[PDB]
Amino acid sequence: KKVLTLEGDLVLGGLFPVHQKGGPAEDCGPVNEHRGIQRLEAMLFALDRINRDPHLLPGVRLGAHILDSCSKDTHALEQALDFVRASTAITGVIGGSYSDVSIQVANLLRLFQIPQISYASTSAKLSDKSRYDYFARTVPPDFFQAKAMAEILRFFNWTYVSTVASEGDYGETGIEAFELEARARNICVATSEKVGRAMSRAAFEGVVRALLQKPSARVAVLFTRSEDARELLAASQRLNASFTWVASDGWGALESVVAGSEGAAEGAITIELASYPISDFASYFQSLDPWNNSRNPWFREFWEQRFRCSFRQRDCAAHSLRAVPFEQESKIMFVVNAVYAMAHALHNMHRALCPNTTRLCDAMRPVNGRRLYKDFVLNVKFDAPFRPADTHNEVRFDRFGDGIGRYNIFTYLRAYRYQKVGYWAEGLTLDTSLIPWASPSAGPLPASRCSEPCLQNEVKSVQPGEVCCWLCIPCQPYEYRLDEFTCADCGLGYWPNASLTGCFELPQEYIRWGDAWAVGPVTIACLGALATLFVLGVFVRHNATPVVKASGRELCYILLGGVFLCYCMTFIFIAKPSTAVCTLRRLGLGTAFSVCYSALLTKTNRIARIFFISPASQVAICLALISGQLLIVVAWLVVEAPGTGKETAPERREVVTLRCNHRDASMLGSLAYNVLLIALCTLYAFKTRKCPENFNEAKFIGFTMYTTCIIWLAFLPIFYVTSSDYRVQTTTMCVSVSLSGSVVLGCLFAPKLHIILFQPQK
């Protein structure tokens, strides 16, 4: 319909969203003021400023040929042809509006490599110069906003969150970057939604209902949609909906999506490119007279959309754009940079081709955009127009033609307005005292986090949630963690290593095994034998009774046969288990036969006979009984073997222990019916005392029998269970053996010992 055209000593055309997207018909929508017309008008002033500048190509009136994109890529593609139809031949496109217009146009222009510099397309798609080898930008890649977004989420510990992006590259490059940046900070995206370029009002509510499916994710991220500034108004609904919106630079300090759409709750965060207002561009725009501004062929229609008195009516344009409040659109600084940058590259192209003259030849003005891009555009050095001394804004390009990756962070506040609360520049800084979520005064801080972060002893459990949402549950004390989703384990003897990456074979219980307890009680048992000995070593010299050389020597030898057998075996012991020890220590608990009864059976048969009698008869009888006792218990190893040199309580696994247990009640079957007749014999023998010897020893034998039976029996009420537990087993066995045997001995030996020891003359 209408196009803006100027004469120029060079022509550097442009393209803007002067109109917004219209309906399904092949027409345009209402004027965009902020992102449309203000940007366009800035370019016109920037041209006047460069034309008047006494240093920048002063010998030339630069002109422009400016197109309305109407936010339809087909329209923009057809209109953009004016730049190549001459092949007027136009020396480089400034702007191209938003991304898919700039991209389908940086796509369109490739056929002739026509240069292009943008102020508002941000997608990383155009960073790949194998497809777009001429195209430069004044704005940073969009994946820096994805970093900012992920970082802001990480700040509020917001580990789990929802997002909305569009079809068209702003969506796919934005969302893919943000997802990677989310993953890199352990942030579980709860869900992500894709919106088209022509989505209905019902579908806008449909997206909100999708975002309301887990109200536990309070945060909803917005990637410009097609253009949030118009489209978010349809989604920020008050129809029982709210979120904490986090938007890309498609929304930034704009009334255009909150007035009448209170779903844009206080605390919504918008990320915009860092910029400064300029009073000289604002002055130009606000001072425009609708009657005199013939240069802009839409300004009078924009006036009718901003003011109700149409230029077709009478007494109109009494008001002014300075008379009524307005705000400068945030990207104006980038627009004027793109204007100057195109001019600078062409100033150096002009000097390079023709330094002695005012203007390019018509054979030169087919400036190859790749030639211009790599040698002239990327090497432009010029301070941003009207920049304050407190900034660093410039038209300087990066190696891919990228702009400056610095953003402002605004918060939407009631008394409604926006305020800057912080910024991002490869790192997040916030002054949270300006955000409604600091020091909350109306309930807790906003929730957007799925589980606690797990401890190193716990495994991912309970909660897939939406996704990635795992709680963790501790492993048991005996379990380790080869997977953070599941606890590992090992057999008995095996217990978690501190790393939780494996098991240790446990130690022994050990106490007094290596330093074997056995030697003490053994030595104490040997004291019986030695006390006996030094007494026998002097006896006839101090208590006469010379039958001690025969009868006394053999009677003591009979007992110590026993004592020995006994202590020798139980002290084969739990030191160094399995081995020489395991076969011959327990043998069904048959050591009380070693002492008390070896002693008593034989001293009995001996006296019975006395009341074949010989020293040899005494030796021979006790040995026959010992061999009988010994053989039938050891003969259970015709069936069995040493073993069970490893166990522990599952209810412990604190140590291994090595307890032999070879069908013990079956081994007791070696003797199980017979020892009660040994007890009865004992009771009879107790009775038979008809010839009391010197010192009335028959009475001391009867006394022995009574108390010994007891002391011995007394151990089994202790042993039967507690033999399973080290300290009690060891202490009680050691003293039991020592003691019981000592009773047998004390009972008959003490008279001879104490008589000689305290009265050697007796």
């Binding site: 139809r85 092949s87 796509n107 490739r110 056929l111």
Partner: protein
């Protein structure tokens, strides 16, 4: 003004290099008769047919706007825009853009508006990339189809170790990379090496190429993707290197069937296999085209120029009569690509005929949907065409817009020395080769093979060469191993020895102690003499059982001693007999037992003599156990404990026969033997000697005391010597039985020394204690 417009409802776009490049600022040169105007007319030829054809676009006129590239990308591109300036005619979709260098620009511009392109000539893979040229299609195959054919052929020839050689530049590099990757993907072929020919080769580099190809000299196959001169120079290098008949060449269409690269190298190139594009001429076009005179094709604004160059004449060099006819007054032949110009035009025609039946079903003219006739829809309809083309050959496109591969396969052969390329077969995405009709200079009709290595014999391993599955190291199997797999063999635990091919194992021969051998004869003889000597002795004691001289000896003890001597001899030879229960019931038990009894009875007699003096340490009474019955009781007590030790040991070590391969074991089982013996442990010697040697020590404690003992006891002298003697035998024994344990020979030494020791203890007692008195007993029973 410099273009052709054919009016129509639907306007087809099109492009030809009707000129070459001009110079000094002029875009357009001479007329490319064949590549340009011949193809251009083939477009209009197919276009007329489409409009005439009742099956495609019924009563809808396919107009066209047709354009002249001048073989310049800027000129081709600047005129191509006119289709979009018309978005004037509706240019719906486009043919051609000729070769690759121009087709990239038309593919660049027309995708910008979602307008499709069908090239008849551009082949380069750089247009198969849908991220940049999504709207592109071609009705000709790309170069990468030769690579698949090459891989298929190398496999067809059963080659697996080849060298790949190519020029620098996309032609060479594309063929090679497609070849290598496709070779890897199909498998069966490994590449010995990959060598490039520089864009600017150095002198002698080609000889260096040959030398490098000879670093892997069994890689007789060479695959070439290089130009005519590069081919010639490789062949010259092979000639200079005298590798004629060693190397065999395979290669691309750059060689084709041209005799040019093999001139004066005919003997070098013979057997070479090349891949040629498959094509046919369109007869209908020639019949049409050959009839066109100036007045029969006035719609073609370049036809006049065509005439001036075709006939070398001027229309305003000779003045032209305006009557000359091509093919008669000037030579004429059809350009092979005419085939694809016609199929490109038809493929568009067919795709338009798909939008017609879907979006304007059965109408005449264009429906409202066909006012935009959205090229985004035409694009799918092109890719989905499947029809017989002008050659009868199906026209399809893959997902990148590439047509299926169609090539002929030729071999360079010398027929009576003639430099000819013969057809072996063809490839239509698959081989059809008459391999038996192929010739190779180093083999005639026999197929040479370019392979890694040679097969292993059974018992030898093919160990994979790391990185090249086709290749192996042949590693023979050894030791006591046998084949498991083609690259594996393993050991047989053994008593089994590998077979001669080491693919299996078989049993090791077993030896017993046979009565002809030195180790069987000695104790066999001794056992027999034993009994004969023993009975001489026993017989005098039995026949004179009640005479004074027998009684005086302690007849009762003499009986037990003599009986034990006899009894042990009776079975001595059996302990080394072939093992069975009749011997494993005796083991060292029975013989050991008689020996032990002999010692105990000698000890009993010894105690009867020496007890009167030793008893003095414990008692001053008369020697205990004097009555002969009581002396026998001792004889019996001393030995009944041996029987108990025996009873226990019998249970512990069971009575069975065993074969132990270990006793004659070797590292190489083919030299191994095993041994058949009763399964008797070394512990059996403790069970025996642990006590019988103590009877001995006791006896010798007494015998040494003889010096103080009265003469009526001189019978002690030979008991003493006997026990000293047999002590020496058992002292001699341990160094033989155990002192030899390091040697395999123990299998006879141990068994022999034992059976012999039995005879010795037995023989010595007779020789010292009884025989000196037997002479006397036999002739003087009263002494």
């Amino acid at each position: 003004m410099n273009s052709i417009r054919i009016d129509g409802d639907i306007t087809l776009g099109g492009l030809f290099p009707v000129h070459g490049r001009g110079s000094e600022g002029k875009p357009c040169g001479e007329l490319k008769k064949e590549k340009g105007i011949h193809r251009l007319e083939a477009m209009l030829f197919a276009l007329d047919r489409i409009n005439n054809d009742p099956d495609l676009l019924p009563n809808i006129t396919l107009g066209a706007r047709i354009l002249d590239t001048c073989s310049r990308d800027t000129h081709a591109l600047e005129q191509s825009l006119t289709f979009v300036q018309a978005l004037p005619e509706r240019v719906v979709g486009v043919i051609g853009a000729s070769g690759s260098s121009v087709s990239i620009m038309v593919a660049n511009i027309l995708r910008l508006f979602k307008i499709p392109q069908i090239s008849y000539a551009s082949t380069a893979p750089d247009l198969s990339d849908n991220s940049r040229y999504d709207f592109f299609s071609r009705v000709v195959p790309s170069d990468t189809y030769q690579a698949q054919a090459m891989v298929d052929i190398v496999r067809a020839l059963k080659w697996n170790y080849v060298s790949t050689v190519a020029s620098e530049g996309s032609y060479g590099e594309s063929g090679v990379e497609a070849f290598i990757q496709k070779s890897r993907e199909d498998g069966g072929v490994c590449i010995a090496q990959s060598v490039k020919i520089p864009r600017e080769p150095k002198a002698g580099e080609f000889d260096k190429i040959i030398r490098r190809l000879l670093e892997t000299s069994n890689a007789r196959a060479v695959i070439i993707f290089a130009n005519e001169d590069d081919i010639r120079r490789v062949l010259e290098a092979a000639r200079r290197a005298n590798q004629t008949g060693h190397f065999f060449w395979m290669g691309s269409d750059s060689w084709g069937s041209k005799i040019a690269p093999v001139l004066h190298l005919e003997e070098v190139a013979e057997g070479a296999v090349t891949i040629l594009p498959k094509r046919m001429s369109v007869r209908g076009f020639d019949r049409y085209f050959s009839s066109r005179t100036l007045d029969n094709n006035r719609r073609n604004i370049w036809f006049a120029e065509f005439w001036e160059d075709n006939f070398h004449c001027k229309l305003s060099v000779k003045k032209c009569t305006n009557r000359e006819r091509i093919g008669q007054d000037s030579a004429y032949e059809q350009e092979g690509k005419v085939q694809f110009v016609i199929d490109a035009v038809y493929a568009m025609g067919h795709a338009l005929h798909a939008m017609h039946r879907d979006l304007c079903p059965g109408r005449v003219g264009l429906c409202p949907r066909m006012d935009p006739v959205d090229g985004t829809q035409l694009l799918k309809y092109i890719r989905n065409v499947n029809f017989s083309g002008i050659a009868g050959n199906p026209v399809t496109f893959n997902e990148n817009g590439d047509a299926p591969g169609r090539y002929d396969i030729y071999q360079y052969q010398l027929r009576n020395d003639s430099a000819e390329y013969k057809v072996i077969g063809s490839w239509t995405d698959h081989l059809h080769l008459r391999i038996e009709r192929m010739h190779w200079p180093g083999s005639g009709q026999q197929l040479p093979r370019s392979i890694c290595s040679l097969p292993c014999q059974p018992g030898e391993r093919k160990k994979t060469v790391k990185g090249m599955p086709c290749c192996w190291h042949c590693e023979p199997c050894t030791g006591y191993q046998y084949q498991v797999d083609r690259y594996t063999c393993k050991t047989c635990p053994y008593d089994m020895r590998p077979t001669e091919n080491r693919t299996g194992c078989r049993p090791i021969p077993i030896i017993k102690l046979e009565w002809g051998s030195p180790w069987a004869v000695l104790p066999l003889f001794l056992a027999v003499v034993g009994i004969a000597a023993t009975l001489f002795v026993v017989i005098t004691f039995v026949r004179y059982n009640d005479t004074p001289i027998v009684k005086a000896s302690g007849r009762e003890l003499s009986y037990v001693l003599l009986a034990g001597i006899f009894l042990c001899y009776a079975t001595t030879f059996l302990m080394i007999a072939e093992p069975d229960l009749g011997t494993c019931s005796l083991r060292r038990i029975f013989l050991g037992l008689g020996m032990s009894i002999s010692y105990a009875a000698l000890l009993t007699k010894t105690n009867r003599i020496y007890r009167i003096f030793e008893q003095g340490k414990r008692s001053v009474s008369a020697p205990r156990f004097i009555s002969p019955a009581s002396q026998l009781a001792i004889t019996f007590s001393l030995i009944s404990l041996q029987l108990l030790g025996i009873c226990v040991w019998f249970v512990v070590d069971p009575s069975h026969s065993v074969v132990d391969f270990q006793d004659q074991r070797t590292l190489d089982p083919r030299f191994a033997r095993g041994v058949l013996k009763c399964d008797i442990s070394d512990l059996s010697l403790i069970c025996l000697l642990g006590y019988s040697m103590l009877l001995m020590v006791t006896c010798t404690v007494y015998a040494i005391k003889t010096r103080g003992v009265p003469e009526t006891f001189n019978e002690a002298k030979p008991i003493g010597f006997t026990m000293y003697t047999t002590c020496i035998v058992w002292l001699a024994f341990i160094p033989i039985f155990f002192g030899t344990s390091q040697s395999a020979d123990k299998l006879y030494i141990q068994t022999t020394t034992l059976t012999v020791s039995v005879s010795l203890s037995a023989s010595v007692s007779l020789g010292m204690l009884y025989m000196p008195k037997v002479y006397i007993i036999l002739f003087h029973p009263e002494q």
